[PDB]
RNA sequence: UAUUAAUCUAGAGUGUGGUAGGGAGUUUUGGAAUUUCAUGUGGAGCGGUGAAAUGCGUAGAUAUAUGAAGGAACACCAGUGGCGAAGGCGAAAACUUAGGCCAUUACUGACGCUUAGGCUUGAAAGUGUGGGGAGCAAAUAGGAUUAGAUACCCUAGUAGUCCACACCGUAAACGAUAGAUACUAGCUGUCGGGGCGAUCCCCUCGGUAGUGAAGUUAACACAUUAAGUAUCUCGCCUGG
């Protein structure tokens with residue numbers, strides 16, 4: 009509430025999110041701020057249901073003109089993040105599209121891939137169970 | 150110590166404070182640098198400009214006292 | 215630079231002013247490029263800022 | 268010598284609409300006129316030529332936008348001299 | 351826009367014909383008026399101009415269209431009696447905002463600070479005092495409202511204390 | 518392991534156990550190391566003069582201790 | 589994602605107020621100094637270099653003081669400075685004109701970035717035409733040095749160096765670092781804007797320097813103005 013600091017979104021949502029999360033992970037920071045989008049929302053909750061980040065609350069002004077969102081990252085007392093590596097395959101002008109029969113498994117299943125086939129974000133294993141392939145957002149491991 | 154900034158002079162013009170500009174001219178008809186006048190860079194530039202205009206207007210000498 | 219009262223006290227400042235006059239006169243008697251002017255002037259300013267502080 | 272406030276009311280559609288592209292294109296046309304007079308007066312003021320090119324291209328982008336969004340939006344604006 | 355001009359007359363001649371020259375060059379202007387003829391009197395020249403050693407300095411304070419000066423410019427150079435024709439405009443670096451004009455306070459307080467006629471010469475113009483009026487006049491807010499109540503979490507510390515025990 | 522009297526310019530991640538005390542003032546130094554010395558001497562069966570002492574023993578003589586900033 | 593129907597303002601522009609700056613062009617002025625001439629003062633050397641010597645000098649040089657002329661460039665202000673997209677911009681003034689900075693509830697409503705091709709600019713040198721030509725100085729001659737010297741030094745000395753109109757379009761045209769966007773420790777400065785408010789200091793928004801963490805780097809080093817974390821686009825490279 010009342011962040012009293014101007015913020016501006018970089019560019020395409022997936023990259024705008026990944027750059028911030030990686031910089032925060034390296035800088036040992038706690039939270040970062042960015043404008044909110046439905047795809048960014050979906051990826052945020054699909055991540056947190058995997059337990060890879062702490063509190064994330066979408067925030068708006070005293071109106072529905074601007075909506076922003078912040079998030080904290082899953083840490084430990086020894087101060088080590090739960091994220092190890094992040095890389096996006098989808099890219100503006102370089103969209104990837106993957107049939108289920110050739111779906112890749114991140115780091116022998118240890119990593120997480122985001123595949124928004126037709127119903128939004130979903131885990132790679134639950135998509136294999138669905139045997140539904142499609143567009144791939146990014147690698148998280 | 151920029152006395153102009155100290156007093157908030159806020160404006161300089163040729164014919165109001167001529168003696169304030171002789172105080173800044175060296176005895177040998179040259180402009181004294183920052184190390185002597187102690188003014189800020191912008192006031193010092195304004196003083197140099199005004200002293201050049203006076204130099205033009207035959208108000209201060211060129212090469213002697 | 216007119217300053218002399220009795221014997222010698224003016225002469226020390228005379229050496230000072232003669233030194234600065236020679237300094238100002240040496241660089242207007244031999245020609246070389248304007249870039250050399252600027253670089254040498256900055257070098258002299260750096261010497262003043264590093265030695266006299 | 269440009270009287271910025273005067274021309275604004277000419278093409279103005281409302282009381283306090285200043286971002287309506289008609290006023291900007293009108294001011295750009297007047298500025299281009301003045302800068303053309305200046306350039307023909309001073310054949311060697313090159314930075315004025317740079318500014319004039321910038322302004323005419325800015326007008327080109329504004330008019331491309333306008334003619335793109337709505338076809339009937341610029342019906343009253345073709346009355347202004349162009350091309 | 352304001353205009354300021356300094357006039358140099360041909361020196362040793364009497365003061366009256368200098369004012370005649372004042373009026374003569376006053377007719378040299380275009381449709382501009384609203385000035386004062388105040389002059390600075392006779393002053394010794396800092397250096398010879400052609401052969402004279404002194405002159406009188408005359409001023410105008412009018413303000414008019416850009417056409418004003420050109421005819422005066424081509425007249426003054428021809429007139430042998432008038433010598434120096436500085437033409438000041440508002441292109442000088444200036445400021446007269448009403449919110450900043452009342453700096454006479456700074457003048458007066460600097461003067462009291464300088465006014466140390468007493469024997470106790472302990473005051474120093476170049477000396478800090480660490481004062482604070484604390485006029486913020488800046489908050490730059492950006493209000494936010496709660497739209498979602500996603501997975502909760504708590505806070506903790508970053509103190510490091512390892513090895514548990516010795517043996 | 519290592520324990521340190523970490524001033525404000527130290528690097529916390531290096532030292533194992535951190536004690537944020539001011540080492541510039543000699544009185545603070547003597548205080549801290551005397552409490553440490555008695556904390557180990559009580560395990561050495563010696564009386565802890567400055568450790569667990571209520572009061573009226575901690576105060577040690579000191580030349581005028583001020584001016585934390587240094588040139 | 590693409591298409592299309594719409595809506596909003598943070599993106600991006602326009603307005604408002606405040607604001608700096610050697611930004612540029614055109615039109616005028618000034619003074620030092622050199623050179624030439626003239627006027628007096630004066631009688632043998634001057635200049636020159638490591639040392640000398642062509643060269644200049646009683647037909648009065650150098651020097652000293654004054655006056656006239658013309659041409660070129662603008663010490664001292666001048667900076668761990670400012671502006672410009674780049675090349676560059678600093679004695680004074682006027683006109684025209686550029687873009688820039690801070691707060692902008694105002695307006696408009698995604699109108700943006702990149703940009704093949706196209707267009708504009710672009711240091712010096714050089715070309716054509718007419719001027720101008722003080723000093724400097726390619727080429728050229730002479731005196732020295734050397735074994736030789738078509739060079740380094742000296743005495744002259746032409747183009748040119750300056751202005752007006754057209755052309756050339758190259759440079760170690762460099763931060764050897766394409767542009768745009770967001771994030772990521774810190775510290776020391778400096779300059780511009782706002783407020784508090786004698787400067788001194790406080791902070792805010794920006795530019796410009798130094799130091800320096802992680803990170804990157806083959807290393808050197810870079811590091812909030814990245815050569816880091818990434819994305820978009822253009823251009824480029826494939827041993828000598």
Ligand SMILES: [Zn+2]
Nearest residue numbers: 151154189192
């Ligand atoms: Zn000042």
